[PDB]
């Protein structure tokens, strides 16, 4: 009955029909004079009608604020107060009322409710307080009192890892002391998870403590007698090494290895401990081989023993490992880890000793990466392109290493030419026709098209990857980054289906996290909680998560779509970040999937300038979108003003150029002039925006520079506060040339590609094309894709 009123009142509040809300609440008031929930509803309705007309301090600070005295135990009344306080950005007072409510009316239900809602706000300090209240009143609860004390420890662990800024220096020691003593009083531990939390509490809240390491080592080693646990393996390995006890390290490794754990970390620690125990090299080698047999680690343990005992890898141990793995993909990384101790010629001679029949495709790839022989990708691929027709369809071909090496070499140039970009496209497309499931070359074909702006053929690749769930956050950045200025086609499956299905991670899965968080605590899966705690934090700060919403706001603006609902979610997302008291963005993009050294390759590669997006660029784009909402009101907001100070205290012009494109930099300065300076300088500012050249060599900038101009002008047209006649003349006149040059630029872009194809057929590109045993693909197909983009751009 309480809920049924809530949406009815909110629905009438939503439709701005506030008049009958008071009477119906008054009817509820006369029936329920003591129901403070209706009193909270009244203020909520009052604030919605006119936020600037009702005194927040008089009506909310004194009854319910941080000094609030009006304290009630009704869960619904407190929930609505927390909701309204969060809606006002008063997160401190939002969770303050529940602590006071639990203080005035302590109960297992109210403490449980406080724990849940504080969990939603990521206030790890509050669950530490909330869990303790549950422990005292655990008598009426469904869980043992020992569970809640661990919950306090986990919450303390939560503050230590992610909310260390919220603790004063004396408080850290007090909470550290509290965490250990609560878990000590519950000894003996009932299960593995309880042991892990105590070890987790000691490991990070008492670092570099000698007695802490010994205590953890003792208890974990005792549990190893009957059960095998990997978490305790991590605990015992780290602290025993800190103990500087080679005898204990040898015993621990020997105990776990004898139990069937084939781990190189155990082997390395066994190897390191034996040397400090002065064990002979042969004794350790036979002991490892006797207990572990012939494995990848055991063969490579001998190489580790060679470096530790002789500072150089002996030919006996290396050849033994090369006896089985010379033609394996893992040979590359294993020998590279020891490249500083291995003689290259001695390794080279062994590779030349093997039979040419054993010198298979993988063997040459291992040769090519080791630098033993000069790059012969063209011949090696030609030699091994015969493996393409005999390999399994689902199996990946290692011939990509040859072809990608050529692709990388050309792409290492700072300014790829039009023919150079097209040259790599031709090579990979034929290989991808031969190797449909090979993501290594297929990802590069994707990246090649996006730089040229050719979305439709690149999007044809994504559906074949079957990207879903976690892969959306880490791999959609090649395609959905800045999508509003590249492929603004609402009717396309690209946006209608692929984009919409990818949002389910953020709109649905992200909201479903709290339910799974609760069961983990209740099922005593405390160990996964801390890692799963990091999972949610990175999600709301994800680069892809923030980019897609802001770009969609521009895309909705570009297509004249409604933005009132869209902004509301942005404020909720912005509110969600703010209550976590850590305003930051999480770069979860997987740049390593394309190249090992992609970090060095991002900033120098113009091939990925469309994906060059940092925290400063993301934060700025949020500011521009937030200005859009505030401009029709014409009022400066403290929300925007405070964020402006958080920007670097440098010249604003230079900050844009380091994180945003030139056209975006001009457009960014456009919105500030009207917002900050009341728009006195648009006449010069708009002229500079139109003076931005649009040349056929700009590749993806051509679509970007056109649509950024298209997006910003449409905003200023729809902004009704523009009253000066003269600036109104140029804004519409500037649009005229923008509509006119819609096809002029594209046919120039279309024309420019044609000569590049002719350049490919001739000179060095043609000669290698004959060497490639690959003939140039037809021009007409990609032109239709480019003309298809021009087809959609006209209707915009």
């Amino acid at each position: 009955m309480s809920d049924k009123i809530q949406e009815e009142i909110l629905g009438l509040v939503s439709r701005s029909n506030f008049k009958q809300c008071y009477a119906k609440l008054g009817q509820l008031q006369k029936q329920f004079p003591n129901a403070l929930y209706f009193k909270i509803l009244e203020t909520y309705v009052k604030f919605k009608q006119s936020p600037g007309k009702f005194d927040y301090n008089k009506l909310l600070e004194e009854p319910y604020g941080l000094k609030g005295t009006t304290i009630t135990g009704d869960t619904r009344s407190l929930e609505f107060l927390h909701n309204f306080f969060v809606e006002l950005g008063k997160y401190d007072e939002a969770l303050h009322v529940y602590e006071r409510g639990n203080f005035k009316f302590p109960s297992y239900e109210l403490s449980y409710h406080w724990f849940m809602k504080a969990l939603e706000d990521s206030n790890y300090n509050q669950m530490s307080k909330a869990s303790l209240q549950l422990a005292k009143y655990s008598d009426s609860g469904n869980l043992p009192k020992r569970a809640y004390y661990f919950w306090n420890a986990i919450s303390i662990l939560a503050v230590s890892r992610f909310q260390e800024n919220t603790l004063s220096d004396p408080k850290k020691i007090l909470l550290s002391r509290l965490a250990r003593q609560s878990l000590l009083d519950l000894k003996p531990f009932q299960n593995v998870q309880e042991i892990i939390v105590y070890c987790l509490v000691l490991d990070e809240l008492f670092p570099q403590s000698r007695e802490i390491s010994e205590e953890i080592v003792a208890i974990t080693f005792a549990n190893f007698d009957t059960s095998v646990n990997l978490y305790l393996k991590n605990f015992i390995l780290k602290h025993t090494k800190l103990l500087n006890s080679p005898q204990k390290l040898f015993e621990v490794c020997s105990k776990l290895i004898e139990k069937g754990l084939d781990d190189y970390e155990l082997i390395t620690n066994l190897i390191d401990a034996a040397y400090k125990l002065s064990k002979s090299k042969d004794e350790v080698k036979q002991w490892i081989d006797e207990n572990l047999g012939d494995s990848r680690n055991t063969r490579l343990a001998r190489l580790k023993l060679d470096i530790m005992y002789t500072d150089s890898v002996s030919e006996s141990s290396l050849s033994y490992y090369l006896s089985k793995y010379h033609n394996k993909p893992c040979c590359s990384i294993d020998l590279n880890h020891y490249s500083g101790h291995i003689n290259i010629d001695m390794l080279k001679s062994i590779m030349s000793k093997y039979d040419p029949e054993d010198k298979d495709l993988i063997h040459h790839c291992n040769i090519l990466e080791l630098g033993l022989i000069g790059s012969d990708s063209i011949n090696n691929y030609n030699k091994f392109k015969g493996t393409l027709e005999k390999k399994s369809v689902t199996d990946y071909s290692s011939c990509s290493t040859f072809l990608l090496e050529i692709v990388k070499d050309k792409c290492k140039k700072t300014n790829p030419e039009l023919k150079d970009v097209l040259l790599c496209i031709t090579i990979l497309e034929n290989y991808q026709a031969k190797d449909p499931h090979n993501f290594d070359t297929m990802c590069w074909l994707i990246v090649l098209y996006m730089y040229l702006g050719l979305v439709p053929d690149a999007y044809f690749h994504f559906i074949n990857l079957k990207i879903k769930n976690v892969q959306t956050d880490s791999l959609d950045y090649m395609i959905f980054s800045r999508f509003s200025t590249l492929f603004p086609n609402k009717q396309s499956d690209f946006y209608s289906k692929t984009f919409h299905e990818h949002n389910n991670l953020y709109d649905t899965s992200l909201a479903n996290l709290p339910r799974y968080i609760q069961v983990a605590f209740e099922r005593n899966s405390y160990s996964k909680i801390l890692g799963m705690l990091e999972m949610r934090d990175k999600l709301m700060k994800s680069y892809t998560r923030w980019t897609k919403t802001l770009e969609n706001l521009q895309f909705s603006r570009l297509c004249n779509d409604k933005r009132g609902h869209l902004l509301q979610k942005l404020h909720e997302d912005w509110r969600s970040l703010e209550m976590t008291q850590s305003v930051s963005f999480s770069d979860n993009r997987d740049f390593s999937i394309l190249d090992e050294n992609f970090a060095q390759f991002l900033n120098r590669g113009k091939i990925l300038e469309y994906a060059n997006l940092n925290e400063e660029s993301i934060f700025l784009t949020l500011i521009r979108e937030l200005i859009i909402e505030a401009l029709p009101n014409g009022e400066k907001t403290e929300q925007i003003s405070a964020l402006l100070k958080k920007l670097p205290s440098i010249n604003l012009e230079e900050l844009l150029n380091n994180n945003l494109t030139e056209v975006e930099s001009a457009s960014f300065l456009i919105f500030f002039e009207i917002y900050e300076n009341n728009g006195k300088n648009l006449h010069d500012l708009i002229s500079r925006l139109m003076k931005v050249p649009i040349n056929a060599k700009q590749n993806w900038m051509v679509s970007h520079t056109y649509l950024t101009k298209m997006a910003t002008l449409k905003t200023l047209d729809s902004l009704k506060r523009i009253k000066d006649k003269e600036i109104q003349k140029l804004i519409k006149n500037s649009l005229k040339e923008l509509r006119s040059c819609c096809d002029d630029v594209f046919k120039g872009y279309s024309k420019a590609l044609v000569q590049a194809y002719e350049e490919l057929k001739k000179d060095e590109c043609g000669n290698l094309l004959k060497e490639l045993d690959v003939k140039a693909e037809n021009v007409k197909n990609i032109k239709n894709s480019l003309l298809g983009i021009q087809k959609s751009v006209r209707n915009l």
């Binding site: 893992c330 079957k466 479903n512 799974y516 899966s525 390593s592 999937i593």
Partner: protein, 195 residues
Amino acid sequence: MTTIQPFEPVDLFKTNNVNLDILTENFPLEFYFEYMIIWPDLFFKSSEMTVDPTFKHNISGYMMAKTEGKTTEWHTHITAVTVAPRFRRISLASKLCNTLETMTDVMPHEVNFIDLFVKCNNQLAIKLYEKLGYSVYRRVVGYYNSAEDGYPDTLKKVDDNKDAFDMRKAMARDRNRSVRPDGRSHKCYPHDVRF
């Protein structure tokens, strides 16, 4: 070199090097959470210390399992096994299978046997499983039937591209009670597999 490491929930962002494989399923994000909530200890990954985490993901694979059944049916079920393309055909798939053996044969699990479902046409997996001591117990007709395919109506019709093998290994404590040499000739509906 390969080291067996716990699979943290945030490691899902570091699994692209394994997840882009065509036969490796990227399960719904909720499904990844369910396994670690009830059975965290068996949710681990294979990592390479030779691969620097700063420049590239070092995860070579991840193993999902569960324990079901009662009394004689108490067993560990292997759900999905995957190995990164860079680390295949080097018996690392065998190591993870043996890793579940030593983990579940001792306390607190002490399971009677290990079972899993593999498609009948998956000859690559069938030879791998049978090599390590696993034995086929029954053929699950229509295990991978979609909604369009509907529920199988008869066990007489069998298709290798649709039926799955109830593909088992017996432990020492089982005394081979849960395995039989004639498991291929036994057929049952997907609903008959209840624990």
